[PDB]
């Protein structure tokens, strides 16, 4: 498209046009800094985005999924083009955000905060362990013995090597890509309570690049995005439909910082 191409192109004319710190801007070199160490967790500044092009605040909330995807395509087509040897280790990228002009306390968010940009914090409690997931749709045809091909929703087209036939199928335990997974339980601090009552909480999902980072009993900072479980069994109802809530993780900052930590000025 004409305008709907300009996003990645403005990222391209961003990471070698916007400058701070007396030349040799970070993201000219931060990306190769990270491709060296084989990390694949590049991070963005929002304030730098406001310094260069303030357009990217209204264009975002209408579907930030697509914003993040159109982000990651740029990191791919940059890195794997300029480091073509790289295409061995992970071959997938996404980016992070760590600058938001707002800290939304718990017990403050409602349906108005649906599917858009967030910041929130709190405390961890008990949650699950570490498990992997699926990533791709591939089956094995069972009438004719072929594979249907590569393709929260099912697809199942009639087109396939078996003369576009074989509604039936079966599945292997290999040749399909996987994805690490973990859950969390976010509870608010027992300092900033309404002074003596039960607290409130939500669940949160984090994804494969972000695991074995959190822990029970810790301090926290997350951007997150507000989810919507699309149906907890709509039917004859209670005095409420049985609906639920999660936030999906984009980027964490921990507050303890128990490692060698700060990024480096040029001088």
């Amino acid at each position: 498209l004409g305008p709907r191409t300009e996003i990645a192109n403005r990222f391209q004319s961003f990471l070698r046009t916007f400058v701070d710190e007396r030349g040799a801007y970070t993201y000219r070199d931060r990306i190769r800094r990270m491709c060296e160490q084989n990390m694949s967790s590049f991070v963005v500044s929002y304030t730098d985005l406001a310094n260069k092009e303030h357009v990217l605040a209204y264009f975002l909330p209408e579907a930030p999924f697509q914003m993040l995807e159109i982000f990651d395509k740029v990191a791919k087509d940059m890195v794997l083009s300029i480091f073509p040897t790289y295409e061995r280790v992970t071959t997938e990228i996404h980016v992070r955000i760590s600058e938001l002009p707002l800290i939304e306390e718990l017990r403050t968010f409602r349906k108005l905060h649906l599917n858009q940009l967030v910041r929130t914090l709190g405390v961890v409690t008990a949650t699950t362990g570490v498990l992997p997931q699926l990533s791709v749709i591939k089956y094995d045809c069972v009438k004719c013995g072929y594979v249907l091909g590569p393709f929260n929703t099912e697809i199942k087209p009639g087109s396939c090597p078996e003369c576009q036939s074989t509604g039936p199928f079966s599945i292997n335990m290999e040749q399909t890509l996987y994805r690490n997974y973990q859950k969390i339980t976010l509870q608010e601090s027992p300092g900033r309570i309404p002074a003596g009552r039960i607290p409130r909480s939500k669940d949160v999902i984090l994804l494969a690049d972000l695991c074995d980072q959190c822990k029970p009993g810790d301090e926290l900072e997350v951007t997150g995005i507000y989810t919507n479980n699309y149906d907890g069994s709509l039917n004859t109802d209670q005095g409420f439909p049985v609906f639920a809530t999660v936030i999906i993780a984009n980027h964490v900052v921990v507050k303890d910082s128990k490692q060698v930590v700060q990024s480096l000025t040029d001088e």
Binding site: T153, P199, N228, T236
Partner: protein, 601 residues
């Protein structure tokens, strides 16, 4: 259809309030004027005004409510559209009020539906927000899925046939979470009323519901005045069954008056820093310039009392300010400070403080030996309700930015008290054995209520042996001011002739000079000032302290000093002035020396 009469009626209601509603003035557009920017979708209405102008739509409104209810949202829309460039985003929240009739749980039958009757009770076991994508889009799968329909029904139903085509009616299109309708509520239970206290039966429980803007402005421990919009609610019921089913009872309500839990902070209708924070300049100007204001203030809260006149000049200390200065990240700097009382048996030790809780807000008093050792900590639980260990509260910590004094300071176990040994200065408390690395904060002052050892003041022993407890605590209490008992008839006859003007039912008290409300508002104005120190006393307090300890050259040191400069910066807050002066110094020095020589044998 039924409700077209209500349509026309609220139409002409609109058409009247379209003009004035009250004496060429309007009270039901300016809420809409404030609404006009964010469009939050609420406008409550008085039911009395229905009795004023529309001439008894109550029996038009008060029985067939639920079927008329949704037509009034369209009424609201037809209102808001008349003047603003309008989309159909407009919605109907309601917080009905001004209705005379206020009934209870027991006058409930199958004939009570679609009404607006009013009820109270108490709040228990409350429950959270719980969103609802009430709406969406749903039809066949060919192309024609844009469905702004009524799929918001209680029982929810995917199945819709079509709009444009003739297609499948069991294969749905997928759902819409993007450009649809979502809303917010919560859910609680409520117990039998304490304003209606019968015998016999249990506290019959009611289910009860609130809308979005009603949400999270209720709370545990409150008595209410609700709507009465009882509903049809979408084993053991072995009656007859039909079809061309066994229900329970439920209820909702859409109006709240969460009263008996309301003060409102500080906002002579005149000009000031803010709207009404100190609009009484006309008199506060005088209340900050009078020269006898100290004594006129002293005797302005204890007319029903007579004793010493030394804590009637001090204890304003506790309610008075501290510092609230602008510094770096060195550490917390503290503002308020302890006080102590000891005395002989019942010289009105307790009536000083039984009332002071009723005096200022946020500062509730009781004892902790009223309960377990759960004064400091919450109730230590070791059985499974949610995750087997829940201790995030207490009672002492329920006084944040306010005080919660005690009585019988002496006979309390040395667990809460040894915890107090730290909890008052480094005002951050911690525990283990059930703590998610427990990090709390109390902030506030205290008042003590000791009682001697034998119940007398025989000067045979030092004060620290007059009480004979553990020691270091008796410094951070920066002023004691003990009340003494003697045996003299003049005093006691003066007391009895206080009772002469306690029950002589006309003029059963003495005249006064300063009323309470003006006093309290002056006090709550006096804090927000950002005080200043630039005074030679600020230069020359070193010799005052050096002289203090020239007297102490014959316990000791600089905790008392911290107190000193805060006592006196408070007594200059009392002068409604910044810019510390060197006299509040001398008074504070005198108070210090009264305290220590009072401690002296």
């Amino acid at each position: 259809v039924k409700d077209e009469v209500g349509i026309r009626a609220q139409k002409l209601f609109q058409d009247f309030l379209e003009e004035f509603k009250e004496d060429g003035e309007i009270k039901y557009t300016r809420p809409a004027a404030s609404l006009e920017s964010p469009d939050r979708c609420t406008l409550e209405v008085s039911f009395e005004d229905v009795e004023k102008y529309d001439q008894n739509l109550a029996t038009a409104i008060i029985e067939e409510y639920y079927h008329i209810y949704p037509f009034l949202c369209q009424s609201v829309s037809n209102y808001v559209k008349d003047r603003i460039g309008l989309k159909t985003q407009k919605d109907c929240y309601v917080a009905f009020t001004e209705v005379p009739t206020r009934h209870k749980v027991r006058d409930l039958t199958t004939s009570k539906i679609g009404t607006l009757i009013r009820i109270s009770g108490q709040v228990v076991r409350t429950h959270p927000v719980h969103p609802e994508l009430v709406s969406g889009v749903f039809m066949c799968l060919d192309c024609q899925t844009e469905i702004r329909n009524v799929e918001q029904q209680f029982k929810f139903t995917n199945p819709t046939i079509c709009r444009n085509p003739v297609c499948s009616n069991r294969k749905r299109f997928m759902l819409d979470v993007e450009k649809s309708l979502f809303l917010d509520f919560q859910k609680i239970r409520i117990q039998e009323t304490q304003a209606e206290l019968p015998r016999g039966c249990i506290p019959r429980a009611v289910e009860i519901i609130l809308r979005s803007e009603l949400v999270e402005t209720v709370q545990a421990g409150d008595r209410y005045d609700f709507t009465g919009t009882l509903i049809v609610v979408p084993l053991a019921g072995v009656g007859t069954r039909a079809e061309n089913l066994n229900y329970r009872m439920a209820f909702l309500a859409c109006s709240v008056q969460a009263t008996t839990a309301r003060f409102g902070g500080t906002d002579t209708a005149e000009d000031m820093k803010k709207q009404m924070t100190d609009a009484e300049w006309h008199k506060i100007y005088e209340m900050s310039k009078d020269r006898n204001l100290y004594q006129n203030l002293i005797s302005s809260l204890f007319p029903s009392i007579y004793g010493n006149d030394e804590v009637k000049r001090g204890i304003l200390l506790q309610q008075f300010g501290g510092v609230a200065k602008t510094t770096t990240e060195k550490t917390s700097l503290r503002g308020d400070i302890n006080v102590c009382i000891v005395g002989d048996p019942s010289t009105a030790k307790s009536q000083f403080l039984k009332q002071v809780s009723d005096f200022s807000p946020r500062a509730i008093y009781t004892s902790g030996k009223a309960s377990s050792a759960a004064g400091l900590t919450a109730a230590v639980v070791r059985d499974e309700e949610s995750f087997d260990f829940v201790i995030e509260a207490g009672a002492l910590m329920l006084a944040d930015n306010g005080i919660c004094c005690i009585d019988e300071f002496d006979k309390m176990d040395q667990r809460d008290q040894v915890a107090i040994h730290e909890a008052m200065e480094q005002q951050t408390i911690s525990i283990a054995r059930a703590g998610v690395r427990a990090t709390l904060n109390a902030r506030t002052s205290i008042l003590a209520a000791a009682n001697p050892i034998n119940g007398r003041y025989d000067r045979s022993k030092s004060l620290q042996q007059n009480i004979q407890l553990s020691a270091p605590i008796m410094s951070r209490f920066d002023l004691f001011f003990i009340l003494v008992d003697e045996c003299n008839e003049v005093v006691d006859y003066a007391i009895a002739r206080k009772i002469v003007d306690l029950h002589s039912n006309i003029e059963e008290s003495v005249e006064r000079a300063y009323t309470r409300e003006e006093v309290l508002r002056y006090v709550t104005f006096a804090r927000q000032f950002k005080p200043v120190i630039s005074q030679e006393a600020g230069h020359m307090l070193v010799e005052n302290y050096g002289h203090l300890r020239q007297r102490d050259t014959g316990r000791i040191t600089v905790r008392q000093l911290e107190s000193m400069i805060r006592l006196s910066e408070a007594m200059a807050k009392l002068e409604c002035s910044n810019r510390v002066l060197e006299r509040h110094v001398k008074e504070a020095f005198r108070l210090l020396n009264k305290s220590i020589i009072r401690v002296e044998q």
